[PDB]
Design an enzyme around this catalytic site. Structure first.
Site, PDB file in Angstrom:
ATOM      1  N   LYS A 229       0.805  -1.220   0.000  1.00 32.04           N
ATOM      2  CA  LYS A 229       0.000   0.000   0.000  1.00 32.04           C
ATOM      3  C   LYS A 229       0.842   1.276   0.000  1.00 32.04           C
ATOM      4  O   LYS A 229       0.705   2.152   0.854  1.00 32.04           O
ATOM      5  CB  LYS A 229      -1.041  -0.035   1.117  1.00 32.04           C
ATOM      6  CG  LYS A 229      -2.073  -1.155   0.877  1.00 32.04           C
ATOM      7  CD  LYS A 229      -3.248  -1.080   1.802  1.00 32.04           C
ATOM      8  CE  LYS A 229      -4.210  -2.215   1.577  1.00 32.04           C
ATOM      9  NZ  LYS A 229      -3.551  -3.528   1.820  1.00 32.04           N
TER      10      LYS A 229
ATOM     11  N   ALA B 180       2.418   4.719  -0.195  1.00 33.43           N
ATOM     12  CA  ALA B 180       1.648   5.938   0.034  1.00 33.43           C
ATOM     13  C   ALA B 180       2.530   7.094   0.473  1.00 33.43           C
ATOM     14  O   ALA B 180       2.220   7.831   1.423  1.00 33.43           O
ATOM     15  CB  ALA B 180       0.574   5.679   1.070  1.00 33.43           C
TER      16      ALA B 180
ATOM     17  N   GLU C  98       9.585  10.502  -4.685  1.00 33.47           N
ATOM     18  CA  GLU C  98      10.950  10.013  -4.603  1.00 33.47           C
ATOM     19  C   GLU C  98      11.055   8.811  -3.671  1.00 33.47           C
ATOM     20  O   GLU C  98      11.798   7.858  -3.922  1.00 33.47           O
ATOM     21  CB  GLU C  98      11.895  11.109  -4.130  1.00 33.47           C
ATOM     22  CG  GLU C  98      13.346  10.689  -4.205  1.00 33.47           C
ATOM     23  CD  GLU C  98      14.304  11.835  -3.978  1.00 33.47           C
ATOM     24  OE1 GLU C  98      13.842  12.996  -3.898  1.00 33.47           O
ATOM     25  OE2 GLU C  98      15.525  11.571  -3.878  1.00 33.47           O
TER      26      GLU C  98
ATOM     27  N   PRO D 242     -11.316  -9.178  -3.010  1.00 35.95           N
ATOM     28  CA  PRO D 242     -11.576 -10.240  -2.028  1.00 35.95           C
ATOM     29  C   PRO D 242     -13.017 -10.745  -2.052  1.00 35.95           C
ATOM     30  O   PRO D 242     -13.505 -11.215  -3.077  1.00 35.95           O
ATOM     31  CB  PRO D 242     -11.301  -9.553  -0.687  1.00 35.95           C
ATOM     32  CG  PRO D 242     -10.505  -8.313  -1.029  1.00 35.95           C
ATOM     33  CD  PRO D 242     -11.066  -7.888  -2.356  1.00 35.95           C
TER      34      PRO D 242
ATOM     35  N   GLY E  56      -7.928 -15.430   2.067  1.00 37.21           N
ATOM     36  CA  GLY E  56      -6.937 -15.507   3.120  1.00 37.21           C
ATOM     37  C   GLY E  56      -7.294 -16.507   4.204  1.00 37.21           C
ATOM     38  O   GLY E  56      -6.993 -17.691   4.080  1.00 37.21           O
TER      39      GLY E  56
END
Lengths: 210, 209
Positions: free
Chosen positions: B68, B70, B74, B176, B189
């Site tokens: 993820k 975020a 750079e 999912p 999962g």
């Protein structure tokens, strides 16, 4: 403020170098000036989370894990737990995923005696798209949840005043002169770690601090 | 679609266990049924990024790094580079930090011959505050940037059709039964990794597929 962290000289080193030798080398030179170092994923992913305990033992510094945690609550809890277990004193957490995701982090921090920093906004150009418009509401969300530590925008002095207004005068705020009128400590990276002699670069930046 | 990844049996294992022994034990037992495994930070932070190469060698599986991402551009570049160097086939990136942050990831993926998945939305309760309202625009941002891989909302069938509408019929979407009418593969999962017989649980999930 007694109830929030004391950062030596109000200067946090953003140690963004990605190889362990350079990171430890450049840092060692500055521990006299800085006692708080922020570490991010490029270093820890490249060298291992064991590098956190290494900083604290070699330098006696506080470590803030700039992991910008941004997952669902259950996963946030596990990220925080692993990060604190590795010895981080604090962790930086996004607010845009909402209150329950933040609370999951606060829960683990309270359990383990560590700290959560709420990232209220970002300063890169893309931040205008979604983050800028959410910043005030994210800061208010933090306040409402009892968050005591915030990371604010790199630039725009007037943004800091606004953030400081929202969070109150007691909470701890860090940001990248005018800045320290609102933030409690400033974050400095490249100026120091890419300097010919970081030791002197640190000392100089500290002189500027009143 | 030929130009996007083939996921065996349309089933991605979300291997969210945090200790290496358990994660490897459960995964090996399902490799006959699954060839694509998603791993996240709890495992890699606990056990080291070397675990990525271990999965690929021991099981011959594709690895999606659910990191993820975020950060600023750079830093995103550096996260992606480290993650691909460790062997990840793909990385999941947030769109809320904006276009330049996503592009930074796409740049490294193109350089290294790997893939970026754009996370368009999340399904936990808190997602209503900011993420839900941004989801359509984030998906459109992806499309405008040439993103070909997307991660969609866990719940709400009608959200998937909306996402599929935005991204077009050729891009790759993971989420999912009803779901595979819109998504190309489903992520599973606990159903599997907390099962007494992961091999059997996988087999059943695959049969229902």
């Amino acid at each position: 403020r007694v109830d929030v962290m004391d950062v030596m000289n109000r200067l946090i080193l953003a140690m963004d170098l990605m190889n362990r030798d350079d990171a430890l080398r450049v840092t060692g030179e500055v521990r006299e000036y800085i006692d708080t170092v922020k570490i991010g994923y490029p270093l820890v992913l490249s060298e291992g989370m064991d590098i956190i305990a290494e900083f604290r033992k070699r330098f006696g510094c506080r470590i803030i894990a700039d992991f910008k945690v941004a997952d669902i609550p259950e996963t946030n809890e596990k990220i925080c737990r692993a990060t604190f277990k590795a010895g981080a004193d604090a962790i930086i957490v996004h607010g845009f995923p909402g209150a329950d995701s933040v609370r999951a982090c606060l829960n683990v921090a309270e359990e383990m005696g560590r700290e959560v920093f709420l990232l209220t906004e970002m300063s890169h150009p893309g931040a205008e798209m979604f983050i800028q418009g959410a910043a005030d509401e994210i800061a208010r969300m933090g306040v409402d949840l009892g968050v005591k530590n915030y990371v604010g925008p790199s630039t725009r002095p007037e943004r800091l005043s606004r953030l400081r207004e929202i969070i109150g005068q007691d909470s701890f705020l860090i940001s990248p002169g005018e800045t320290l009128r609102f933030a409690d400590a400033i974050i400095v990276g490249r100026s120091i770690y890419l300097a010919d002699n970081p030791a002197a670069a640190a000392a100089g930046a500290i002189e500027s601090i009143k």
